[PDB]
Amino acid sequence: AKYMFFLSFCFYFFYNITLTLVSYYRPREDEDLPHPLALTHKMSWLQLLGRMFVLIWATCIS
Amino acid sequence: FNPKYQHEGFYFGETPLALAACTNQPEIVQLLMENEQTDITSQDSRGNNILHALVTVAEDFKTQNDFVKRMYDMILLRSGNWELETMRNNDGLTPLQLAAKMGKAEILKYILSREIKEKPLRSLSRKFTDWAYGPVSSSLYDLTNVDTTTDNSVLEIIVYNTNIDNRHEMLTLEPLHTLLHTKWKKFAKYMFFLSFCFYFFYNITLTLVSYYRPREDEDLPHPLALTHKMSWLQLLGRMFVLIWATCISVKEGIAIFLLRPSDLQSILSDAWFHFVFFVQAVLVILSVFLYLFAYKEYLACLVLAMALGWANMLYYTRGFQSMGMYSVMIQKVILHDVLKFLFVYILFLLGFGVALASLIEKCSKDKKDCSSYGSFSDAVLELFKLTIGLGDLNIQQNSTYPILFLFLLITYVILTFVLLLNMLIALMGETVENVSKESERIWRLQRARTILEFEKMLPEWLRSRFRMGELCKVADEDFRLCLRINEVKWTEWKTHVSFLNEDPGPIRR
Amino acid sequence: NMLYYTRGFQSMGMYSVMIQKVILHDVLKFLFVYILFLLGFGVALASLIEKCSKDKKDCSSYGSFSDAVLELFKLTIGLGDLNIQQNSTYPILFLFLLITYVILTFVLLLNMLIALMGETVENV
Amino acid sequence: FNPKYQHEGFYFGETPLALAACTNQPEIVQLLMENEQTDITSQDSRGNNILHALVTVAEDFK
Ligand code: NA
Ligand code: NA
> Is the backbone of residue C92 left (phi > 0), alpha (psi -120 to 50) or beta?
alpha
Q: Determine the Cα–Cα distance for residues D40 and D21; give it in Å rounded to an integer.
A: 12
Decide if B178 contacts B146 (C-beta within 8 A). no
Q: Which amino acid is it at B398?
A: N
C24 three-state secondary structure: helix
Q: Determine the Cα–Cα distance for residues B504 and B133; give it in Å rounded to an integer.
A: 8
Q: Determine the Cα–Cα distance for residues D6 and B489; give it in Å rounded to an integer.
A: 11
Torsion sign (Cα): B439, B442, B447, B449: negative
- Cβ within 8 Å of residue B98, ≥6 positions away: B52, B55, B56
Q: What does each C-alpha distance from B224 to B188, B238, B241, B342, B469 come to in angstroms? A: 35, 6, 10, 41, 52
Q: Which long-range contacts (CB under 8 A, 24 or more apart) does C44-48 make?
A: C44/B303, C44/B304, C44/B306, C44/B307, C44/C97, C45/C72, C45/C94, C45/C97, C45/C98, C45/C101, C47/B210, C47/B299, C47/B303, C47/B306, C48/B300, C48/B303, C48/C89, C48/C94, C48/C97
- Cβ within 8 Å of residue B505, ≥6 positions away: B131, B133, B138, D2, D7, D8, D9
Q: What is the DSSP string of B11-33?
A: -S-SSTTHHHHHTT-HHHHHHHH
Count, in order, helices (H) and strands (E) of chain B. Answer: 21, 2
Q: Determine the Cα–Cα distance for residues C124 and B307; give it in Å rounded to an integer.
A: 38
**Chain A partners within 8 Å of B358 (Cβ):** 23
* Distance from Cα C75 to the centre of ligand 1, integer Å: 14
Q: Pick from B46, B126, B114: which is nearest to B75 by CA?
A: B114
Residue C40: exposed, middle, or buried by beta-carbon count in 10 A (0-12, 13-18, 19+)? buried
Please give the method by which this entry was determined. cryo-EM
Half-sphere exposure of B143 (CA within 13 A, CB side): 25
- Which residues is B483 bridged to in the sheet? B468
Q: How many CB atoms lie within 10 A of CB B14?
A: 15
DSSP-derived secondary structure letter, B283: H
Kindly provide the b/e burial profile for residues B110-149, where b requires at least 16 CB atoms within 10 angstroms of the residue's own CB. bbbebebeeeeeeebbbbbbbbbbbbbbbbbbbbbbbbbe
Residue B96: exposed, middle, or buried by beta-carbon count in 10 A (0-12, 13-18, 19+)? buried
Closest chain C residue to B335 measured between Cα atoms? Answer: C108
Per DSSP, which regions of B145-257 are E strands? none
Half-sphere exposure of B486 (CA within 13 A, CB side): 18
Q: What is the DSSP string of B43-96?
A: --SS---HHHHHHSS---STTS-S-HHHHHHHHHHHS--HHHHS---SSS--HH
Which of B354, B360, B365, B399 has the most A C-beta neighbours within 10 Å, making it the best mutation to test the interface with A?
B354
Which pairing describes strands B486-487 and B138-139: parallel, antiparallel, or unpaired? antiparallel
Q: Identify residues of C whose CB sits under 8 angstroms from chain B CBs.
A: 25, 29, 32-33, 36, 39-41, 43-44, 47-48, 51, 65, 75, 77-82, 89, 92, 95, 99, 102-103, 106-109, 111-112, 114-116, 118-119
- Which residues is C7 bridged to in the sheet? C9
Q: DSSP 3-state helix, strand, coil percentages of chain B (rounded to 5)?
A: 50, 0, 50
* Distance from Cα B432 to the centre of ligand 2, integer Å: 10
Q: Determine the Cα–Cα distance for residues D16 and B304; give it in Å rounded to an integer.
A: 74
Q: What does each C-alpha distance from A30 to B237, B362, C23 come to in angstroms? A: 62, 10, 63
Q: Determine the Cα–Cα distance for residues B408 and B406; give it in Å rounded to an integer.
A: 5
Decide if B136 contacts D8 (C-beta within 8 A). yes
Resolution in A: 4.5
Find out whether B389 is annotated in a ligand binding site.
yes
**Chain C partners within 8 Å of B392 (Cβ):** 82
Q: Determine the Cα–Cα distance for residues B240 and B246; give it in Å rounded to an integer.
A: 10
Q: Identify residues of A whose CB sits under 8 angstroms from chain B CBs.
A: 20, 23-24, 28, 32
Q: Identify residues of B whose CB sits under 8 angstroms from chain D CBs.
A: 133-136, 138, 487, 490-491, 493, 504-506
Torsion sign (Cα): B356, B359, B361, B365: negative
Minimal C-alpha gap between D8 and chain B (Å): 5
Q: Determine the Cα–Cα distance for residues B14 and B216; give it in Å rounded to an integer.
A: 81
Q: What does each C-alpha distance from B112 to B69, B100, B108, B125, B128 come to in angstroms? A: 12, 12, 6, 9, 11
- Examine chains A and D and say if they touch (3+ CB pairs below 8 A): no
Q: Determine the Cα–Cα distance for residues D12 and C120; give it in Å rounded to an integer.
A: 39
Q: Which amino acid is it at B168?
A: H
Q: Which long-range contacts (CB under 8 A, 24 or more apart) does B63-71 make?
A: B64/B106, B65/B24, B66/B106, B67/B24, B67/B26, B68/B106, B68/B107, B69/B106, B69/B107, B69/B110, B70/B26, B71/B21, B71/B22, B71/B24, B71/B26, B71/B29
Minimal C-alpha gap between A50 and chain B (Å): 18
Q: Determine the Cα–Cα distance for residues B430 and C115; give it in Å rounded to an integer.
A: 9
